[PDB]
Every structure is written in structure tokens, then in C-alpha cells.
């Protein structure tokens, strides 16, 4: 069996060969990423004299269409004045090559998960976390401009990359799962650890689900561990409940999947159901962040910029992002005015 004249493997992926050169322009270096969409390779652009990252989409109509949506949104974004657009990875161009759709992006550095692995999952300082947070909020602000109304849908450490391994500037990548504010066709979305309550509950969702994700990410950048690391949806909701309590009644009364996690008592109130979890609301974020005990594992005592005052402003911003009600969950514009960023 031969695939795409020998260029593809059985998984519809282009067989990457180091040193090969395409269209007498790009010189392939090495594979730097895999995913259900296909692969990501580091290449050198002879014409522009620069390094670029090329995303080679699998040779399958299903994935090809997924990518065309990504191209559309990217082109739509990169057609907007503001410098806010500079927190979104830039698509230089795209072309079909040997039946594969290729997207050429500016070359970037490590993703934040890699960064967390180098701290051996102990986290980065509160000051570095603040820099990331401010950029992330500005990116979400940009995705929220009316004409765009883009929901990334897959924010997580792996999709936030540093521009330069020395500087702290970051960029959001991978809009393959993104959509514009529209109609809840799909329901099983976002990576589990960062899945918002409304998605878990099967309710309508909008741009707010990205802010919930951000909150989970910030806490994880600082503590070094996922705030809610469920092994499945039920375990995921229970871990969320340990920290924020039972969701408000008005929300559960409309949750199509509420009875998958809770039970409505004969009196109208809700409680966790059957089946290792501290009581609702007993696992305070105050303690998780170590506000009064020198940060996570007390490993931040004496470190400049880690006073109780600082930690409080951080605990506050996070709680405003992890609000159960998507209607009152803090939006990008105001998060940026929060006293946590106040100089």
C-alpha cells in the first residue's frame, strides 16, 4: 500500500524528512510538534532569510476543513489595526504542497507547559505570572472585539508560547478548535482541566469560557499544578466544587446535565450526588496559593514581591475569573484594570 505517491504514512501525515526542501524555498529542519491535525516543523525560509514554523495538515478532508476555518479566523484577526493583535501568533502565508495544506507562522519558543516542567512543576514567580496574565487578558480583550467575537476554546499551557526564550513575551497559538460566538452545535469542548462549569453542565457558552480557563492557568503557573485535575467529567466537577462550593440554584435549575453531578432534594436545593472530596467550599484558594504562608509549599518566603498584600490582589482576580455565573464572571477589559496589575 502506497500513500499520496509515498509522501504520506497510514495516519495521513506527511513523512517529514530533515533537510528536504520545498518549492525551492523552505528548507525543512526537524519535527517540533504533533497533533490530531498533523505536524509542525521548523524550517528555514531562503527567500525571507528567517526561521518559520510550518503546520502541515493531514491529507484528509476532515482535517483540511478544520484548518481552513483556522486560516479564515487568523486572516480575519491579522486584518486589525491594534497592537493587541500582536499577542496572537501571526500567519505569514499558506499554500498547498503535495496535497497537504501548510500554514507558515513566525517561529516561536517554548510553550508554558515546557516552562512548568523545567521548574519541576513548582511554578514560576508571581511576577512572571503577572506578566503572562496581563498579556493573556489583552489577547482575550482582542478576541472579544465585536467584529471578531472569537472563542479560542482550547487555552491551556501547551498553547501559550514564548516569543524569545529569554524574554517573557507570549503568543497564543492553535485556533484549530476555535469558533466565533454562534450556536452550541458541539458540547464536549476545552481540555478537561480547563473546562468551564457551563460546558460541563451542558449549558450555552460564549467568550466567558476563555476567562475561566485563564484563571485555572494562572493558578497553575504559580503553584506548578493544575487547579482542578479531574480524571473524568464527574471527578472534574467535584474538584471544582471542593473549591467554589455548589453552583447557585438558578444555574443548576437550567443545567441540562445538572443531574449528572447533583441531585435536587424535595425542597428545591441541590447537593452533590453519591460518588475522597473535602466538603463543598472547604478547599480555599487562600490556602492553595499559600497567601499567608509564603506561597505554594511556602517556597516563596522572603522573595521580593510576594507579600500578603500582593497575594491578596492575586487571589481576588482569580476568584473573579472563576465565578460560576458566566454572566457576572469578570471580563477582559475590567480584569486589566484590576489592582493586581496596578503599578
Ligand X SMILES: COc1ccc2c(c1)[nH]c1c(C)nccc12
Binding site for ligand X (CB under 6 A): 32-33, 35, 40, 53, 55, 89, 105, 107-108, 161, 173-174
Q: Measured from the CB of residue 28, what is the shortest distance to ligand X in angstroms?
A: 14
Give the C-alpha separation, 331 to 141, whole Å: 8
| β-bridge partners, 97 | 100
Radius of gyration from C-alpha coordinates of the chain: 22
Contacts of 83 (CB under 8 A, 6+ apart): none
Give the C-alpha separation, 111 to 313, whole Å: 26
Q: Measured from the CB of residue 276, what is the shortest distance to ligand X in angstroms?
A: 35
Question: Residue 3 or 22: which CB sits closer to ligand X?
Answer: 22
Q: Measured from the CB of residue 176, what is the shortest distance to ligand X in angstroms?
A: 7
Q: Measured from the CB of residue 159, what is the shortest distance to ligand X in angstroms?
A: 7
Q: What are phi and psi of 8, to 5 degrees?
A: -100, 155
Residue 260 marked in a binding site: no
Active site residue 24: no
Residue 319 marked in a binding site: no
Question: Residue 108 or 200: which CB sits closer to ligand X?
Answer: 108
Residue 252 marked in a binding site: no
Question: Residue 44 or 341: which CB sits closer to ligand X?
Answer: 44
Give the C-alpha separation, 109 to 34, whole Å: 16
Residue 273 marked in a binding site: no
Question: Residue 42 or 257: which CB sits closer to ligand X?
Answer: 42
Rounded (to 5) percent helix, strand, coil in the chain: 35, 20, 45
Q: Measured from the CB of residue 172, what is the shortest distance to ligand X in angstroms?
A: 9
Q: What are phi and psi of 328, to 5 degrees?
A: -105, 0
- At residue 54's C-alpha, the angle toward residues 50 and 56, to 5°, is 160
Question: Residue 35 or 230: which CB sits closer to ligand X?
Answer: 35
Residue 55 marked in a binding site: yes
- At residue 202's C-alpha, the angle toward residues 314 and 250, to 5°, is 70
Catalytic residue among 154, 174, 210, 323: 154
The three cell numbers locating residue 26: 523552505
Residue 36 marked in a binding site: yes
Give the C-alpha separation, 22 to 43, whole Å: 10
Give the C-alpha separation, 17 to 334, whole Å: 48
Active site residues: 154
Binding residues: 32-40, 55, 105-108
Binding residues for ATP: 32-40, 55, 105-108
Amino acid at each position: 500500500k502506497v500513500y499520496n505517491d509515498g509522501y504520506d504514512d497510514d495516519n495521513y501525515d506527511y513523512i517529514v524528512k530533515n533537510g528536504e526542501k520545498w518549492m525551492d524555498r523552505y528548507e525543512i529542519d526537524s519535527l517540533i510538534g504533533k497533533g490530531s491535525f498533523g505536524q509542525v516543523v521548523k524550517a528555514y525560509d531562503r527567500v525571507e532569510q528567517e526561521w518559520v514554523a510550518i503546520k502541515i495538515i493531514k491529507n484528509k478532508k476532515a482535517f483540511l476543513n478544520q484548518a481552513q476555518i483556522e486560516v479564515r479566523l487568523l486572516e480575519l484577526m491579522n486584518k486589525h489595526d491594534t497592537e493587541m493583535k500582536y499577542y496572537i501568533v501571526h500567519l505569514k502565508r499558506h499554500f498547498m504542497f503535495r496535497n497537504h495544506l501548510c500554514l507558515v507562522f513566525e517561529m516561536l519558543s517554548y510553550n508554558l507547559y515546557d516552562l512548568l516542567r523545567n521548574t519541576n512543576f513548582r511554578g514560576v514567580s508571581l511576577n512572571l505570572t503577572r506578566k503572562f496574565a496581563q498579556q493573556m487578558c489583552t489577547a482575550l480583550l482582542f478576541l472579544a472585539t465585536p467584529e471578531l467575537s472569537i472563542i479560542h476554546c482550547d487555552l491551556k499551557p501547551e498553547n501559550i508560547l514564548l516569543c524569545n526564550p529569554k524574554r517573557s513575551a507570549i503568543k497564543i497559538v492553535d485556533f484549530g478548535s476555535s469558533c466565533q460566538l454562534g450556536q452550541r452545535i458541539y458540547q464536549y469542548i476545552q481540555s478537561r482541566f480547563y473546562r468551564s462549569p457551563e460546558v460541563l453542565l451542558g449549558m450555552p457558552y460564549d467568550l466567558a469560557i476563555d476567562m475561566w480557563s485563564l484563571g485555572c492557568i494562572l493558578v497553575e503557573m504559580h503553584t506548578g499544578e493544575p487547579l482542578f485535575s479531574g480524571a473524568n467529567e464527574v471527578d472534574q466537577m467535584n474538584k471544582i466544587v471542593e473549591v467554589l462550593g455548589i453552583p447557585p440554584a438558578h444555574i443548576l435549575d437550567q443545567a441540562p446535565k445538572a443531574r449528572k453531578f447533583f441531585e435536587k432534594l424535595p425542597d428545591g436545593t441541590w447537593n452533590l450526588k453519591k460518588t475522597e472530596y473535602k466538603p463543598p467550599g472547604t478547599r480555599k484558594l487562600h490556602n492553595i496559593l499559600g497567601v499567608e504562608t509564603g506561597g505554594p509549599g511556602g517556597r516563596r518566603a522572603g522573595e521580593s514581591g510576594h507579600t500578603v498584600a500582593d497575594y491578596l490582589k492575586f487571589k481576588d482576580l482569580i476568584l473573579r475569573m472563576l465565578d460560576y455565573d458566566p454572566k457576572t464572571r469578570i471580563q477582559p477589559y475590567y480584569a486589566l484594570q484590576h489592582s493586581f496589575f496596578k503599578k
